[PDB]
Design a protein around this ligand. Structure first.
Ligand SMILES: *[C@@H]1O[C@H](CO)[C@@H](O[C@@H]2O[C@H](CO)[C@@H](O[C@@H]3O[C@H](CO[C@H]4O[C@H](CO[C@H]5O[C@H](CO)[C@@H](O)[C@H](O)[C@@H]5O[C@H]5O[C@H](CO)[C@@H](O)[C@H](O)[C@@H]5O)[C@@H](O)[C@H](O[C@H]5O[C@H](CO)[C@@H](O)[C@H](O)[C@@H]5O)[C@@H]4O)[C@@H](O)[C@H](O[C@H]4O[C@H](CO)[C@@H](O)[C@H](O)[C@@H]4O[C@H]4O[C@H](CO)[C@@H](O)[C@H](O)[C@@H]4O[C@H]4O[C@H](CO)[C@@H](O)[C@H](O)[C@@H]4O)[C@@H]3O)[C@H](O)[C@H]2NC(C)=O)[C@H](O)[C@H]1NC(C)=O
Ligand SMILES: CCCCCCCC/C=C\CCCCCCCC(=O)O[C@@H](COC(=O)CCCCCCCCCCCCCCC)COP(=O)([O-])OCC[N+](C)(C)C
Ligand SMILES: CCCCCCCCCCCCCCCCCCCC(=O)O[C@H](COC(=O)CCCCCCCCCCCCCC)COP(=O)(O)OCCN
Ligand SMILES: CCCCCCCCCCCCCCCCCCCC(=O)O[C@H](COC(=O)CCCCCCCCCCCCCC)COP(=O)(O)OCCN
Ligand SMILES: CCCCCCCCCCCCCCCCCCCC(=O)O[C@H](COC(=O)CCCCCCCCCCCCCC)COP(=O)(O)OCCN
Ligand SMILES: *[C@@H]1O[C@H](CO)[C@@H](O[C@@H]2O[C@H](CO)[C@@H](O)[C@H](O)[C@H]2NC(C)=O)[C@H](O)[C@H]1NC(C)=O
Lengths: 104, 333, 142
């Protein structure tokens, strides 16, 4: 914050072992694909300051979503399709099915 | 009187930045605890609250006096003037001491330099619960602590024989679980700074069934038998049976949503969502069965007449079998 | 482990007010049970009506149990409200089972069907009243 690039210099110690403990991180929903360590300088109205960046790339898991909100949609659409086997004489059943599926 | 003179002579030429025996040998610290209450174990955040009375005792040859009084008993007004080890809990999400009305601390300096330092803590420790076998799951998840800046060559911790002593175990907020035991452990870990002596206390929790038994299991089995009730209504009344099936499916999916909303987002299949999925399948199979029955009535009536009585026996037997299998398997696993 | 300490204790005795739980659980449960027993006075020819009655009352009781269990802590035993909701669920399920039995005996032994229907028009309300009296008496005396 206070010291510009002619007063302080940031660098990672090792440049690849500076950040450890990533492979041990378990997330309930995501999965750490990789992580990058960047060293650069930013320029503000008051000076040029050093900067490091630790950038993770989280990839989201899909199992929970399939079991939670994709399967019910497919089963409700199939429950809508069953109305095609019902004969056209029953007007209170096919309506029922279709309306209920729409609501769901 | 003369205790003021002793306290003044102990703090004359005293540097509270240098551990006792800074360049001789590591400082042996004996740690004890007193678990007041193990707070609620919420699985959503994979954490659990605990309230303890952390006691640390070590030897300080600089706080060594020679008078008639054997022990100096002091409040938290002299804790910030002597050396105090920087013990921190390595798996605590958020923890804090108590300050009402006066900082809850105690300092007892014996005659030969032996110091006892006790404080009250409320630690929100972290433990990644493996939410398989849910809700028939058992966990054993720890509370780890070690020095922060002093490696193994400077600070060595060591349990006492009767170190960890739980309280009454009855007025605790362990709702869904049940305390079954504990065990202490000492190891050495490697860090970018050095080698540290890490102590651990493992608490064994067993999830008692109940809330889930009455929140999801009974509702879903009662929905299954509700879906079976349709097998006895006459096959000519189409709208009644279609309404039965579709509303039963709707309630089933609502109950599955709630049951999964109980525990956090996990990408694997537990033992509860498996149950609600089997129940869903049952209801869907009863509905497609009635659909095929109604479709075959137009083609061949005797086929449907036999199919109805076949299903009336085939469904409850398959459900009893499923239950038996499921329950026995998980209770043995 | 350190010594003997003097401890001053102060208990504040409390007593829960049942008005809100009455209004939001016991009235909906009782009204659902009544709406369910209404399905006995409908004629035996209207099957879809009684089926709707039964199914919707069972669903209402399920959602009522769910909404009633949310207010409390996640406790691992059964409360009094839990017993009341269980008994009301049993009553609605028994009404549905009776309708199913009547429909099963209809068109084959309609005398027996009409007999059990006219008997269930009196057996359910008296049993529910007796259960209400027993429950309220044994739980308000304490
Ligand atoms: C970013 O900014 C943040 C905000 O500025 C900043 O947070 C602040 O950090 C500082 C330092 O870390 C904190 O200051 C210290 O706080 C310690 C305890 O903190 C707890 O309590 C405070 C409230 O403090 C009141 O209550 C205590 C306990 O009663 C009193 O001791 C205090 O004096 C104070 O009392 C006044 O206020 C009361 C009303 O509350 C009145 O009733 C009372 O009459 C007084 O008027 C809480 O706010 C804290 O919560 C925060 O911190 C926790 C930490 O875990 C967080 O979890 C939480 O979320 C909050 O963030 C916490 O609960 C004090 O003990 C400490 O003072 C001692 O240490 C200093 C330094 O060593 C000494 O100089 C000082 O003299 C004190 O030592 C004396 O007392 C101790 C008692 O243990 C003795 O052992 C010791 O020997 C010494 O006694 C000697 O001297 C005495 C005179 O001093 C004498 O009487 C004795 O006889 C003897 O001779 C210090 O005040 C500050 O609270 C934080 N503020 C906030 C809002 O968090 C943060 O760090 C910054 N971040 C970074 C990266 O920099
Ligand atoms: C067979 C079908 C029968 C069925 C009878 C079922 C009775 C169920 C309720 C019994 C409990 C009860 O009366 O609640 C409270 C009254 O609250 C009231 O004053 C409202 C009473 C409504 C009664 C509806 C019948 C109880 O009030 P209490 O003070 O505990 O005692 C009663 C005092 N009192 C009589 C002066 C009211
Ligand atoms: C939506 C659903 C229906 C809505 C419309 C229906 C109309 C119903 C009218 C009822 C009015 C609501 C009552 C408001 C006040 C209230 O709940 O008072 C409570 C009464 O509980 C008690 O006195 C305890 C026992 C009685 C409560 C319930 C008993 C019902 C049993 C009836 C059996 C009938 C069915 C049999 C077939 C306690 O309030 P408080 O504790 O704050 O203070 C008073 C101390 N009592
Ligand atoms: C103080 C009260 C506390 C009790 C607690 C719960 C009680 C539930 C509500 C009452 C149950 C039934 C009410 C009295 C019986 C009705 C009277 C006429 C019926 C009858 O004749 O009996 C047969 C059964 O019908 C029927 O009535 C069939 C339904 C009866 C039981 C069905 C099983 C449902 C299970 C409920 C639990 C499920 C979920 C619970 C969480 C009809 O036919 P029949 O030919 O045999 O009659 C032989 C004569 N012809
Ligand atoms: C708790 C029990 C109290 C509620 C009713 C008792 C159970 C059923 C009714 C009594 C027994 C019964 O079946 O008698 C019917 C009820 O009469 C009646 O009184 C008609 C139904 C009303 C019963 C009690 C509620 C009073 C409010 C009535 C409002 C409308 C007045 C009438 C237009 C009359 O006929 P039945 O069913 O024996 O048929 C002929 C046989 N199958
Ligand atoms: C707490 O830690 C102490 C010290 O490690 C354990 O005490 C040892 O217990 C074993 C078997 O019980 C004995 O063979 C050792 O002699 C004991 N050591 C000392 C120094 O007393 C104690 O068992 C631990 N508590 C547990 C695991 O619950």
């Amino acid at each position: 914050y206070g010291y510009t690039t002619d007063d302080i210099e940031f660098y990672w110690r090792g440049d690849d072992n500076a950040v450890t403990g990533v492979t041990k991180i378990e997330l309930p929903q995501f999965s750490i694909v990789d992580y990058k360590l960047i060293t650069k300088k930013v320029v503000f109205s008051t000076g040029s300051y050093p900067r490091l960046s630790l950038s993770f790339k989280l990839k989201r898991n899909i199992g929970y979503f399939i079991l939670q909100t994709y399967m019910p949609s497919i089963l409700i659409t199939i429950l809508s399709w069953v109305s095609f086997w019902i004969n056209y004489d029953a007007s209170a059943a096919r309506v029922a099915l279709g309306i209920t599926t729409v609501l769901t | 009187g003369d205790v003021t003179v002793i306290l003044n002579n102990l703090l004359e030429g005293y540097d509270n930045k240098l551990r006792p025996d800074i360049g001789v040998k590591p400082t042996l610290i004996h740690t004890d605890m007193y678990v007041n209450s193990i707070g609620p174990v919420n699985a959503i955040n994979m954490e659990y609250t605990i309230d303890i009375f952390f006691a640390q005792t070590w030897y300080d040859r600089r706080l060594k006096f020679n008078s008639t009084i054997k022990v100096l008993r002091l409040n938290s007004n002299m804790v910030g003037k002597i050396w105090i080890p920087d013990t921190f809990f390595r798996n605590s999400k958020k923890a804090d001491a108590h300050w009402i009305t006066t900082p809850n601390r105690m300092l007892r300096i014996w005659n030969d330099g032996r110091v006892l330092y006790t404080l009250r803590l409320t630690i929100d420790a972290e433990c990644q619960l493996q939410l398989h076998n849910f809700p028939m799951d058992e966990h054993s998840c720890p509370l780890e602590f070690s020095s922060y800046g002093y490696p193994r060559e400077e600070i060595v911790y060591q349990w006492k024989r009767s170190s960890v002593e739980v309280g009454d175990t009855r007025s605790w907020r362990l709702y869904q679980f049940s305390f079954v035991g504990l065990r202490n452990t000492t190891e050495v870990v490697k860090t970018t700074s050095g080698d540290y002596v890490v102590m651990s206390v493992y608490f064994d929790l067993s999830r008692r069934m109940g809330y889930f038994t009455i929140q999801t299991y009974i509702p879903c089995t009662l929905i299954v038998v509700l879906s079976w009730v349709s097998f006895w209504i006459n096959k000519d009344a189409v709208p009644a049976r279609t309404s039965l099936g579709i509303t039963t499916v709707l309630t089933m999916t609502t109950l599955s949503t709630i049951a999964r909303k109980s525990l956090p987002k996990v990408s694997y299949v537990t033992a509860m969502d498996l149950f609600v999925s089997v129940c869903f399948i049952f209801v869907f199979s009863a509905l497609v069965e009635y659909g095929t029955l109604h479709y075959f009535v137009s083609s061949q009536p005797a086929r449907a007449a036999k199919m109805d009585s076949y299903a009336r026996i085939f469904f409850p037997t398959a459900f009893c079998l499923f239950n038996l299998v499921y329950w026995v398997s998980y209770l043995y696993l | 482990s350190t010594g003997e300490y003097v401890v001053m204790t102060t208990h504040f005795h409390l007593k829960r007010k049942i008005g809100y739980f009455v209004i939001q659980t016991y009235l909906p449960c009782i009204m659902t049970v009544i709406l369910s027993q209404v399905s006995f006075w409908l004629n035996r020819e209207s099957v879809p009506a009684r089926t709707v009655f039964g199914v919707t009352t069972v669903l209402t009781m399920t959602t009522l149990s769910i909404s009633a269990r949310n207010s409390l802590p996640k406790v691992a035993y059964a409360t009094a409200m839990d017993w009341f909701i269980a008994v009301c669920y049993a009553f609605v399920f028994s009404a549905l089972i009776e309708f199913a039995t009547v429909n099963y005996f209809t068109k084959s032994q309609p005398a027996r069907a009409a007999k059990i229907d006219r008997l269930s028009r009196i057996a359910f309300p008296l049993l529910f009243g007796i259960f209400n009296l027993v429950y309220w008496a044994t739980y308000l005396n304490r």
